[model samples]
Target: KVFERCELARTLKRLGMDGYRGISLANWMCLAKWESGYNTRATNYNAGDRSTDYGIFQINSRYWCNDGKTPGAVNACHLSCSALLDDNIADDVACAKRVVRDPQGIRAWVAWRNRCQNRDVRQYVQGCGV
Candidate 1:
């Protein structure tokens, strides 16, 4: 797991985000771990049909990078391609930072996390609590 963490940090670096600072990277890893366990092609089961919320970032296909929309947008993580919302480290980091900065990550993350342990799931599910 630590090795994976190192890889995550390196990936974050490639995206120009410091994964070691501000508990940001940790938050990312936790989200990925919870959502898809680092699986880029991960999707969700909404009722019977599947939802296109893919990858470690878990970006929805409609509002984010998907085969339909700007397939290469990468939402905010900057992963390989937004096609599957895979591992776009920079874009993911950017999205996370945006969430943090939007509601002031430190303050609201506290409220969402109840003193830490949540994630910014599409700006709703209260961090990894989803």
Candidate 2:
């Protein structure tokens, strides 16, 4: 599903992403905007690592989900990468929560660092009523 801006804001907040591990909803919004444009089916293959990033959060196969093709993948999320591509985001949200539990927190996404870090991200959820 390709979510509208405010629609995604409300959804993420309901999923408890508003301030999960000190990362605000706007920050997650910023990450999603640049990462996958809020599209659940989005996927990006990294030729360098032979791993794929799947879904709205662009969760990676090398260290997170298992795609069965990424060499040396850890599958930390313990689920198929295909699960992230569906319209139902409950599993995606669960995996995302596990991701932020790491020391890097929201920095797990390089896109967030390059685009959302230290920026004025309030615009992402400004009028979303999140």
Candidate 3:
């Protein structure tokens, strides 16, 4: 599902993530945009290796979800990787929250480190009225 950016902002806020775990709404939205472009079905596969990142937050199967074919996945979210490719993002958000709590925090998202960190992301939610 491709989400309207504004709707995604509102939805994430209503789902209690606007300021959840010390991460601001803009930060979360920025992460989501950089990772998935708010498309629930986004999946990235690198030709060099077997790593695959899935869904909005692009949770990796190597550590977060099991694809069965991925071989010995850690499955930290305790769910199937395919589960992340859906319009319903509730599970996605829950898993993201868990990931952020780890020592790495939100920087677990490489895009956050490279694109969003230390940047003012407030514009992402500026006119959303959330």
Candidate 4:
């Protein structure tokens, strides 16, 4: 599913993720814009290792969700990677929380490191009426 940035922000807030677990609402919106552009079907296959990133958060396979063909994957989320490629974001949010609990926290997402870390992302959610 595709979402306007504000719509996604509202939904995320409704799901009890309004800045919960150290990820601010603005940060979440910024990460989504970079990772999936709010597209639920987005997936990224790493050029070097063929590991995949899935869904709005671009959850990665090296430690989070496991692609069926990835060898020796540690599927910490206990669900299929494909599950994240859907309009429903509940599972994605749950797994994302686990990823945040990981030692890397939100740094697991390269996009966050590149575009969001230490940046003021308030504009991403500004005027969203949140």
Candidate ordering by TM-score (highest first):
2, 3, 4, 1
The RMSD of every model to the true structure, in order and in angstroms, is: 8.7, 0.7, 1.2, 1.2
TM value for model 4 = 0.93
> lDDT per model, in order?
0.48, 0.92, 0.89, 0.87
Q: Write the per-residue lDDT of candidate 4 for residues 18-129, one digit (tens) a residue.
A: 6677778888888889999999999988877768889998888877897877666789999899899989999898898888886778888888899999998999888888
Q: Which candidate has the top score in TM-score?
A: 2
Give the runs in model 2 whose Cα sits over 4 Å from its true position: none
Best by the lDDT measure: 2
- Worst-scoring 10-residue span by lDDT in model 2: 16-25
Regions of candidate 4 where Cα sits further than 4 Å from its true position: none
Ordered from best to worst lDDT, the candidate numbers read: 2, 3, 4, 1
lDDT of 3 by residue, 27-117 (tens): 9999999999999999998555577999998988888888876655688889888999999999899889889889898989899999899
Clash count for each candidate, listed in order shown: 14, 0, 0, 0
Shift in Å, residue 104, candidate 1 = 8.3
Ranking 1 against 4 by TM-score, winner:
4
Name the lDDT of candidate 4. Answer: 0.87
For model 2, the local distance difference test gives: 0.92
The TM-score that candidate 1 achieves is: 0.49
Q: On a 0 to 1 TM-score scale, where does candidate 2 land against the true structure?
A: 0.97
Candidate 4 collision pairs: none
